A paper describes a structure:
The bacterial pathogen Neisseria meningitidis, or meningococcus, binds several complement regulators, including human Factor H (FH).
In addition, the 1.5 Å-resolution structure of one of the isolated Fabs defines the structural rearrangements associated with binding to FHbp.
Author numbering:
A (entry chain B): 2 to 215
B (entry chain A): 1 to 137, 143 to 222
The structure:
C-alpha cells in the first residue's frame, strides 16, 4: 500500500499567517490522485481540494495544493479562525485507499494565565459513597500546564486525571479540568485539599485550596 | 442539498453484529459509488469499504474482509454495512460518504455524513450520576460532574441552551474503573449567584438517562 505521512503533526500559527502542510508518500504517484480533507471537532471530514488543486464547493481560494512524486503540500494563505482544524491527505489512485495520519492546525495567540478554581466533592456524591475533587484552569494559553494535588501536604501521584477543551472559538484559549479520585474514607479522614498550578503566564505557581468541613 | 445520515451504531459485545445504514437525499444515488470510512476515538481516518453505483463491485480493507459486507438499495437511496464477528478494534465512528464517480474507491469523497458511533465492548450500559460543582463563597465558576457512565456519549447544556457564553464542557475521561466521567463548567457574574438559576441539562441517550440539575451555592 501507499503510506502517507503528514508533517508536522501539529502546526501552530497566528491568524493572517500562511500555513504549509506536508504529505509524503512511500511510493511516487500522480498529483491527480490526491485529495485533502478538513475535519473540525465533532464534525465529519469535508473535502477541501483535490486532483491536484480543484476546490470543493464552498472552499475559499486561499487553499491550494502543489507538489509531485512523493512530496505534496497544502498551502493556506491568510489563515482565518475558521480554518483551524485537522487536515488529512488521501490518495485514491492505487488500491487500497490510504490516508495520512492528520496534521492539527492550532491557533497561536498571546500567552494568557489560567484562572483557577477548586471544587470539593458534593454532599450528594459523598452520600453516594465516592469522592471527586475538581480543579479548573480556565481560559489559558499555551496548552502546557502542570497541576499538582496535595492532601494534608502529601503530593498525590497517579490518582488524578486531566481533560482539556478544544481551543475556544472566540479567544483561542484552552480550559482544563483535573479530577482527584479518593475514597470517601480518605476524603473524610484528611483536612486540607490543594491544587497548585504552574503555567507560563504565571510569574509563580498559583494554589487554590479548601479545608473539608470549613 | 446533499444529505447523508447514518444509523445503526451503538454498544455491542465482541463477536456481535450490527447493521449500519446511511439514508441519503439530494443527489441521484444510483449513479455514484459510495464508501464507508471509520475513525477510532482520538485516531485518524481509515477507509473501510466501497461499492460501485450498481452494487456489482465491492472493495474492502484487509482488516475487515469477511466480517463486514457493504451493500446498497438504490430504490431506497440507502447504503448499508452488515458487521459481524465484531472486535474491540472495530470501535470507531463510521462515516458514510459519496464518491465523485460511479466506480468504487477511485475518486475523492465529496460529501460525508456526521457518522454513527460503534462501541465494541463487554461492559454493560450504565447511566451517570450528576453532581453539582457549586460556586464558592466579580466572576464565579460552577459546573456539573457527570460521573460513571458507559458507553460514550453524554451531552451537556446549560439552562436548556439559553446559557452558552463561558461554558466549557470537557472531553470525557475513561476512569481506571472502565467507566467514563466528564465535567461541564460555566463562569458567571458573582452578583447573579442565588438569584439567577443555573441548571445543567445532561443526556446519556445510551441509557435513556436525562437529568436537569440545579447548581446552587
Ligand atoms: Cl471496479
Ligand atoms: Li443505569
Ligand atoms: Na504545579
Amino acid at each position: 500500500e501507499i503510506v502517507l505521512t503528514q508533517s508536522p503533526g501539529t502546526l501552530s500559527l497566528s491568524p493572517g499567517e500562511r500555513a504549509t502542510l506536508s504529505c509524503r508518500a512511500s511510493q511516487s504517484f500522480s498529483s491527480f490522485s490526491l485529495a485533502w480533507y478538513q475535519q473540525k471537532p465533532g464534525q465529519a471530514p469535508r473535502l477541501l481540494i483535490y486532483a491536484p488543486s480543484n476546490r470543493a464547493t464552498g472552499i475559499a481560494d486561499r487553499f491550494s495544493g502543489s507538489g509531485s512524486g512523493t512530496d505534496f503540500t497544502l498551502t493556506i494563505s491568510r489563515l482565518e479562525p475558521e480554518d483551524f482544524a485537522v487536515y488529512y491527505c488521501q490518495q485514491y489512485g492505487s488500491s487500497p485507499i490510504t490516508f495520512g495520519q492528520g496534521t492539527r492546525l492550532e491557533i497561536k495567540r498571546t500567552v494568557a494565565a489560567p484562572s483557577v478554581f477548586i471544587f470539593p466533592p458534593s454532599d450528594e456524591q459523598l452520600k453516594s459513597g465516592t469522592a471527586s475533587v475538581v480543579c479548573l484552569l480556565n481560559n489559558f494559553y499555551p496548552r502546557e500546564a502542570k497541576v499538582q494535588w496535595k492532601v494534608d501536604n502529601a503530593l498525590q501521584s497517579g490518582n488524578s486525571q486531566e481533560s482539556v477543551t478544544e481551543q475556544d472559538s472566540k479567544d483561542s484559549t484552552y480550559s482544563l479540568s483535573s479530577t482527584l479520585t479518593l475514597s470517601k474514607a480518605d476524603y473524610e479522614k484528611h483536612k486540607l485539599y490543594a491544587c497548585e498550578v504552574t503555567h507560563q503566564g504565571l510569574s509563580s505557581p498559583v494554589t487554590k485550596s479548601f479545608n473539608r468541613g470549613e | 442539498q446533499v444529505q447523508l445520515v447514518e444509523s445503526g451504531g451503538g454498544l455491542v459485545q465482541p463477536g456481535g453484529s450490527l447493521r449500519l445504514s446511511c439514508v441519503t437525499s439530494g443527489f441521484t444515488f444510483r449513479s455514484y459509488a459510495m464508501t464507508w470510512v471509520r475513525q477510532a476515538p482520538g485516531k485518524g481516518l481509515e477507509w473501510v469499504s466501497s461499492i460501485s453505483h450498481s452494487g456489482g463491485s465491492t472493495k474492502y480493507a484487509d482488516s475487515v474482509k469477511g466480517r463486514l459486507t457493504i451493500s446498497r438499495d438504490d430504490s431506497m437511496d440507502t447504503l448499508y454495512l452488515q458487521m459481524n464477528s465484531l472486535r474491540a478494534e472495530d470501535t470507531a465512528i463510521y462515516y458514510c460518504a459519496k464518491d465523485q464517480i460511479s466506480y468504487p474507491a477511485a475518486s475523492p469523497l465529496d460529501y460525508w455524513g456526521r457518522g454513527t458511533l460503534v462501541t465494541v465492548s463487554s461492559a454493560s450500559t450504565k447511566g451517570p450520576s450528576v453532581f453539582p460543582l457549586a460556586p464558592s463563597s466579580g466572576t464565579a465558576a460552577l459546573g456539573c460532574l457527570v460521573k460513571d457512565y458507559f458507553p460514550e456519549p453524554v451531552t451537556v447544556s446549560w439552562n436548556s441552551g439559553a446559557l452558552t457564553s463561558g461554558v466549557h464542557t470537557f472531553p470525557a475521561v475513561l476512569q481506571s474503573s472502565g467507566l467514563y466521567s466528564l465535567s461541564s463548567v460555566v463562569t458567571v457574574p458573582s452578583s447573579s449567584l442565588g438569584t439567577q438559576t443555573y441548571i445543567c441539562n445532561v443526556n446519556h441517550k445510551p441509557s435513556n438517562t436525562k437529568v436537569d440539575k440545579k447548581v446552587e451555592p
